[PDB]
Amino acid sequence: KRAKVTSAMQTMLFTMLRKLDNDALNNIINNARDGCVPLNIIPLTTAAKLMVVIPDYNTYKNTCDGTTFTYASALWEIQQVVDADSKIVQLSEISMDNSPNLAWPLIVTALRANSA
Amino acid sequence: DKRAKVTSAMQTMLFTMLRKLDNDALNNIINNARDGCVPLNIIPLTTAAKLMVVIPDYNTYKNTCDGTTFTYASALWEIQQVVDADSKIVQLSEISMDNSPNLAWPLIVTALRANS
Amino acid sequence: ASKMSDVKCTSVVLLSVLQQLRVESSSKLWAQCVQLHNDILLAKDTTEAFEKMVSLLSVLLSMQGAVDINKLC
Amino acid sequence: SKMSDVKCTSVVLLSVLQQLRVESSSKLWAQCVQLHNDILLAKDTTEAFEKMVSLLSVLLSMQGAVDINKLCE
């Protein structure tokens, strides 16, 4: 019974979240459905880092532009990108030509650009 | 303290949600409680199950009691006993408009749930 | 359907309100509250969910002096 | 309205995190509780939603604990 109650509560939670229809919540939810998930709690102050998994180039080009990462309705300055082999990836490498040569998924470490 | 502020906010939100649900049974027991007509035990859902309720005044009595039937929580209950504030039995013929000032209010009604 | 999510959300809040009122120290009473909360979460239709909500809410309404009803309303 | 719904959702979210065995003595749990408290005390939706983003991200960061696609079904 305990597993059914947990399933019911979690399903109701995301039904409630959908009905709220908030842009920031929908962004992190829909990103999570595509495998673009945070690795730590999303901070609201610039004095804390954020780490997010970027599963493929299609997601990368929809959220990243130069040193700026767009996520949770906010801007983040990228500090590090590491590939699936835990090797550092230069931002110049993450282009449309060199993308097949990268080891996806990538993990981006970023600092919040502005307060919430 | 801070715990009391959080508690107050949670309880206020709870009755806001309950009001938004707008269920007849919930509205009935909420509206009764704000008038002082409160249950003394968990409201049961099965036939012939026991229930005790405080009746604060004659106006509440007339709105909820008709002969031996008690109407409460969108259900019908079979009145077994009525006792006054001094735990003395009150016959139903005493509970009239002319005689109610002579009674030791509030009364406590004991009843059994009916069917359907 | 949409009211099913709302009533299930409200039942979680109601159990949390009872928990902060220290009903959990009463082992048997809290056990009944948890079971009612579980029955709402697993309710097939709104009729059953509201019937169980009547029982669960009556726990809060029966606690004399625990809350000021007319102020919270 | 959105204000009551957001606060109700935040109570459900903290309950969901509690059942997923987030240790009550951990730093993460104290952060979740503080966010939950701030949402309940929030006066406008902008503050509440920003805090809900942080609180919900705790659930989205727990890999293998929940499958979001099945819950959004």
Swiss-Prot record, chain B:
Subcellular locations according to the entry: Host cytoplasm, Host perinuclear region; Host cytoplasm; Host endoplasmic reticulum
Superkingdom in the source lineage: Viruses
Role: Plays a role in viral RNA synthesis. Forms a hexadecamer with nsp7 (8 subunits of each) that may participate in viral replication by acting as a primase. Alternatively, may synthesize substantially longer products than oligonucleotide primers. Interacts with ribosome signal recognition particle RNA (SRP). Together with NSP9, suppress protein integration into the cell membrane, thereby disrupting host immune defenses.
Quaternary structure (record): Interacts with nsp7, nsp13 and nsp12 to form the replication-transcription complex (RTC): nsp12, nsp7, two subunits of nsp8, and up to two subunits of nsp13. Eight copies of nsp7 and eight copies of nsp8 assemble to form a heterohexadecamer dsRNA-encircling ring structure.
This protein's name: Non-structural protein 8
Source organism of the structure: Severe acute respiratory syndrome coronavirus 2 (2019-nCoV)
Taxonomic lineage from the root: Viruses, Riboviria, Orthornavirae, Pisuviricota, Pisoniviricetes
First-to-last residue of the parent protein present: 4020 to 4135 of 7096
From Swiss-Prot, chain C:
Assembly behavior: Interacts with nsp8 and nsp12 to form the replication-transcription complex (RTC): nsp12, nsp7, two subunits of nsp8, and up to two subunits of nsp13. Eight copies of nsp7 and eight copies of nsp8 assemble to form a heterohexadecamer dsRNA-encircling ring structure.
Domain of life: Viruses
Gene label: rep
Subcellular location: Host cytoplasm, Host perinuclear region; Host cytoplasm; Host endoplasmic reticulum
Protein name: Non-structural protein 7
Its biological purpose: Plays a role in viral RNA synthesis. Forms a hexadecamer with nsp8 (8 subunits of each) that may participate in viral replication by acting as a primase. Alternatively, may synthesize substantially longer products than oligonucleotide primers.
Taxonomic source organism: Severe acute respiratory syndrome coronavirus 2
The RdRp Nsp7 cofactor domain, residue ranges: 2-73
From Swiss-Prot, chain D:
Subcellular location: Host cytoplasm, Host perinuclear region; Host cytoplasm; Host endoplasmic reticulum
Protein name stated in the entry: Non-structural protein 7
UniProt superkingdom: Viruses
Residues of the full protein shown: 3860 to 3932 of 7096
Function, in words: Plays a role in viral RNA synthesis. Forms a hexadecamer with nsp8 (8 subunits of each) that may participate in viral replication by acting as a primase. Alternatively, may synthesize substantially longer products than oligonucleotide primers.
Quaternary structure and interacting proteins, as annotated: Interacts with nsp8 and nsp12 to form the replication-transcription complex (RTC): nsp12, nsp7, two subunits of nsp8, and up to two subunits of nsp13. Eight copies of nsp7 and eight copies of nsp8 assemble to form a heterohexadecamer dsRNA-encircling ring structure.
Domain RdRp Nsp7 cofactor: 1-73
